[PDB]
A paper describes a structure:
Transient receptor potential vanilloid ([name]) channels are a group of six polymodal cation channels subdivided into two subgroups by their sequence identity and functional properties. TRPV1–TRPV4 comprise the first subgroup of non-selective Ca2+ channels, TRPV5 and TRPV6 constitute the second subgroup of Ca2+ selective channels. [name] channels are blocked by ruthenium red (RR), a universal pore blocker for a wide array of cation channels. Here we use cryo-electron microscopy to reveal the molecular details of RR block in [name] and TRPV5, members of the two [name] subfamilies.
We also prepared cryo-EM grids of [name] in the presence of 1 mM RR without the activator. The dataset yielded a single stable state with unique and strong density at the SF: RR-bound [name] (TRPV2RR) in C1 at 3.3 Å resolution with a wide SF and closed lower gate. The presence of RR stabilized the TRPV2RR SF in the TRPV2Apo2-like state but did not reveal the expected shape for the RR molecule. The TRPV2RR SF harbors a large asymmetric density coordinated by Glu609 and the Gly606 backbone carbonyls from only some of the [name] monomers. Yet RR is not tightly coordinated in this position, resulting in somewhat amorphous density. Thus, our results agree with the previous observation that the TRPV1-TRPV3 SF is dynamic and can permit cation passage even when the pore is closed at the lower gate.
Numbering used by the authors:
A (entry chain D): 31 to 45, 74 to 414, 429 to 524, 527 to 560, 590 to 612, 616 to 652, 655 to 693, 699 to 720
B (entry chain C): 31 to 45, 74 to 414, 429 to 525, 529 to 560, 590 to 612, 616 to 693, 699 to 720
C (entry chain B): 287 to 381
């Protein structure tokens, strides 16, 4: 729907010097043909930025047309055009003019000049009063599915995302209008946030992003030395490290976490090396915004806010791996105390459901069951109230939080039905019992032997498709068999066919015996074909020579980050990790010490 | 058996200067022994092209043998032999002589000269009056499963297919008789068609074909600027782009679709870049004979006429992917309205079958059922009348049409029998009901999640393993029945089959041991056959095949769109042309289609 | 020297057939020489036209007409797991 930004074949829409003559002159690049434009503007009292000299739908001015038609990086009409604009006395300069269409809103000639990689044009524009903080905020420049190009929204951000060091240096160090590193787009994303967003985990793109991130950190150490760029938070409250954690950009996240500089750039480092002895290397890691002591940390963002498949690979990176290991070692006793409490509760549940001072003890057991159901209901509801989005964004590693809530709800319903003397309380009680015994498997993640999936992913994906196909088959054959016997009702026939399909029962077979037999044979063969299809489709993922340890570590990380908050009835005070050491200039940080042994890496440094 | 073209060991078939002496002389290459041949020919009143001086079967002349026996790229007897022929007063010169055998029909000395890669021989033959438009119509030069070499039929096409740029340049630019790029073989195939037909999807052959195609296009633009070579249609009615689409030549079809040139050859381009901004590139694609508005479009040829396994790889190329996506987005509502109508009809079917003032409602349901069956039968019959070829050439993606037709036929027959009050109407009705419920899975292709979600193998393994299993079943059934005489062949077959699929159980009487042995043997043999089933099906999975399910779904959507675009059989739908008319060079106005491409990986490869 | 038979009645070509030595077997079957050593060859090129190459293969001790030929030795006297790879060699395949 939006018109092309530039089209050699299609003329601009319209939604002496007319617009077409001027646009043809600036497109061909000859400046001598511009004579008479200024006189015409003076005579008609017009201005070069009026709607009569712009594209109707967007607002593309003549200058932007000139920049879009650069030849060898230069266009001879730009400087005379700006001179004509200045001589015309235009109250709003032709430079800094921007589009108004929703797709290209905010787009200016400086963005075109930077994108075309013409440093000369950038110099010419900035000299003539180009604003270097103009924001291109149209739909084309926003991050979404479809045709778009997100680079931030500032000229400095566009130059950074396009790998232009000369243009970035000029913009930062020009005297006419210096660009600001701490400038933000409409979303509050600075140049570092823009670099994080444009990054994908491919090696070359990661190398480019890392290179320009480090270069911009050094440039922000040179200029404005009193400003800490990495601490700037966008409108979502995310620093570049936290934004990388949320977006699942593992490469830049790892680089930022383990960033180490030598020489003058030491304060920019986050990893400090303490001592080495052969293959043993000991380093300090900065826990700024990483420790879960603070609200909305990197650990919490990775556990509960990230949704990328790279999520489990981030928790094994240092210092996250060692930090989470220390937390798990600290809280391993609380985990198994919870396991023992649940085991005792389930034992009482089993005894009470089985046996329906004996009578008084049974009543006491029922009271204890109701109290446990009430407690678990309150705990699960609070968990959902706190982490509603985590359930939706990753069901594959959070369904136990739903099963516990369902078990508590069923227990409460069974008890209240028993109070109302209803006879439908036994089914709810037995479902509660079986669901609790199933949920007992949650605590198998506490030890490695049972804690350490592939079929769980495919079933949660293909369940709906396979159910749709098999239910279409089942309904068709059930109605076909029921209609021919006039197998009492549709539900009974469907139950019979399903029980035969899963091998629980035989098939019943009255004239038209041959047709009933043919229908049953067709059903059996079709279901065998469908099950074989399912088996092979599940098989194709296993044989790919494909990380269970990382998933188990992520599970332990989630369990630890949930256990740190304490119970709902008792908030637990958190402890800062590491110690407040001085690393430079009083540059005091909450560093964390990690010892690492690597024979293979050390043996390569030997002659 | 056709005789060898030039055998150093086998003498030419028959079937002073005799033929054998002349053939020996021209094979040696020394022209001195040719002296006296003209005098003998004049005295005996004979020409070099007569029947006795040629191979009996093919009609190969001494000139062809001289060209066949080129040494170091030249044969010194060529010019003396031609001089003797022209001095003999031959009314039909030896240069234009051609073979007569059905295998080598149309073969000439110029063809041999071009094949031998001897430019000197080609120049010498052309200078002496060789016709550069002779067509080799023999079976050796046609394309068929066997010993054949198809290069078109013209010398220019032979030179183009053999990567001889000098020969092509001379043939098109010689003053004696300039070759024409518009010339066509027996099938109507020009040089571009011949290049398309010899194309193989291997990278080397594709590169050779692309290079020669571009070179010939540019050289034709230079020599014949008033004509368009890509618009010439053969006897099948296909342009080179459409010929590549039909035959499955993907790697040249893509190149033709996305051809782009800058400079003097821009009018030959089909992709025109409008603007670029970072990783975003926007280009105009020429929809000439690509859009389904025209008859025999590229889309229709790929969907319904192509039989190559590369069908689904072709509908994912630009601009075909974007064009089909836009067509689907325009016709997505019509698809689901059809789904809703079919669902309502099937619901009425289920109600009527289940319920076999209430009587009036049942009669209304019956007549609605008959009308629905009639509508589907007419709709499917028209589809087959239009696409008789598509069902046969590809069953894996057209069996749902057959199922719909069968459901309609069964519904109509069931209603007819119900009117006739035949007792067999109910089985037909229930079979129609179950078949129509199974046909409801056609519409899953509308939405991607289940649309993307063995079928190829079942036409490749079942037709063999059912033969083996039926041999086993019949043998053991007759063995059991004859020993028990289980009371009939069909009874034993049914019991054994039901046990095999696990549905039934076997029942064991004199010779109980032999019966038990037979049953054990049958069970073990069937278990081995089922293991072979499972292993054969498994090996196709560990083969590490690519994820082409997405492309197959796109091709299914393309077929559904191209059939929905014609409208219903009772109401022809007006065609909507895609793209807009734009000027792209010189009065050269084309119907271009705008496609926008975002590619970070490609763009980053251009940065320093 | 090719026609000398050992105590088992096998020429070097037949011995290579029996023992399953596929590489030397193919080389002996498809032996081609130019110039002075042409008579020692077993394969002769007749004519070539583009991709089509036509050649003559010597059928001495290979055709089943002779008793104890290469074909019979491969079919019934060889025990190597390479037998099915030998029947697809020229001129055995077309014969
Ligand atoms: C009558 C007792 C009333 C409760 C008083 C508090 C006792 C301590 C509570 C406790 O340890 O709870 C453990 C557990 C927590 O749920 P989870 O995080 O394992 O679950 C979340 C997993 N996603 O919760 C349970 O296992 C609930 C069981 C409640 C009854 C315990 C009977 C024995 C008490 C000594
Ligand atoms: C008796 C109807 C008289 C004509 C009235 C017009 C009704 C519209 C028909 C229609 O859109 O077709 C629906 C469907 C065709 O499936 P398909 O060709 O897409 O599938 C092609 C598969 N290869 O065909 C059917 O579902 C057949 C039954 C149509 C009537 C259903 C009752 C509801 C009408 C509103």
């Amino acid at each position: 729907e939006p018109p092309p930004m530039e089209s050699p074949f299609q003329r601009e829409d319209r939604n002496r010097f007319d617009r077409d003559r001027l646009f043809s002159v600036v497109s061909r690049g000859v400046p001598e043909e511009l004579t008479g434009l200024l006189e015409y503007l003076r005579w008609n009292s017009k201005y070069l930025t009026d709607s009569a000299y712009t594209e109707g739908s967007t607002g593309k001015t003549c200058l932007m047309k000139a920049v879009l038609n650069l030849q060898d990086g230069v266009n001879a009409c730009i400087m005379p055009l700006l001179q004509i604009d200045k001589d015309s006395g235009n109250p709003k300069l032709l430079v800094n003019a921007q589009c108004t269409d929703e797709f290209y809103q905010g787009h200016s000639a400086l963005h075109i000049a930077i994108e075309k990689r013409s440093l000369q044009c950038v110099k010419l524009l900035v000299e003539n009063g180009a604003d270097v903080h103009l924001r291109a905020c149209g739909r084309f420049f926003q991050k979404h599915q479809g045709t778009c190009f997100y680079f931030g929204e500032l000229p400095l951000s566009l130059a950074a995302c396009t790998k232009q060091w000369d243009v970035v240096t000029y913009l930062l160090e020009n005297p006419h209008q210096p660009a600001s590193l701490e400038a933000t787009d409409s979303l509050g994303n600075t140049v570092l946030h823009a670099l994080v967003m444009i990054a994908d985990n491919s090696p070359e793109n990661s190398a480019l992003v890392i290179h320009m991130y480090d270069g911009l950190l050094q440039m922000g150490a040179r200029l404005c030395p009193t400003v800490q760029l990495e601490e700037i938070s966008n409108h979502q409250g995310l620093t570049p490290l936290k934004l990388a954690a949320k977006e699942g950009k593992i490469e830049i996240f790892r680089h930022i976490l383990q960033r180490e500089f030598s020489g003058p750039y030491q304060p920019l480092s986050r990893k400090f090396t303490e001592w080495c002895y052969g293959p043993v290397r000991v380093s300090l890691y900065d826990l700024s915004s990483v420790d879960s002591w603070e609200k909305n940390s990197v650990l919490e963002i990775i556990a509960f806010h990230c949704k990328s498949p790279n999520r489990h690979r981030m928790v094994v990176l240092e210092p996250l791996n060692k930090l989470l290991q220390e937390k798990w070692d600290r809280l391993v006793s609380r985990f198994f105390f919870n396991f023992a409490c649940y085991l005792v509760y389930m034992f009482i549940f089993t005894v009470v459901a089985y046996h329906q001072f004996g009578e008084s003890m049974l009543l006491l057991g029922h009271i204890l069951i109701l109290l446990g159901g009430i407690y678990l209901l309150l705990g699960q509801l609070w968990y959902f109230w706190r982490r509603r989005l985590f359930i939706w964004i990753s069901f594959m590693d959070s369904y136990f939080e739903i099963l516990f809530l369902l078990q508590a709800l069923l227990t409460v319903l069974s008890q209240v039905l028993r109070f109302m003397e209803t006879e439908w309380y036994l089914p709810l009680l037995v479902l509660s019992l079986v669901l609790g015994w199933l949920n007992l498997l949650y605590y198998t993640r506490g030890f490695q032997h049972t804690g350490i999936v592939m079929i769980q992913k495919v079933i949660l994906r293909d369940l709906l498709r396979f159910l749709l196909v098999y239910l279409v088959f089942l309904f068709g054959f059930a109605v076909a068999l029921v209609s021919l016997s006039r197998y009492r009702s549709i539900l009974d026939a469907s139950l019979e066919l399903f029980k035969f399909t899963i091998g629980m029962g035989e098939l019943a077979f009255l004239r038209f015996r041959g047709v009933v037999l043919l229908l049953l044979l067709a059903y059996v063969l079709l279901t065998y074909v469908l099950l074989l299809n399912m088996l092979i489709a599940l098989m194709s993922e296993t044989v790919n020579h494909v990380n269970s340890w990382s998933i188990w570590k992520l599970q332990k990380a989630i369990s630890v980050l949930e256990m740190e908050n304490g119970y709902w009835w008792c908030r637990r005070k958190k402890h800062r990790e590491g110690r407040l050491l001085k690393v430079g200039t009083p540059d005091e940080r909450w560093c964390f010490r990690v010892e690492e042994v690597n024979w293979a890496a050390w043996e390569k440094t030997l002659p």
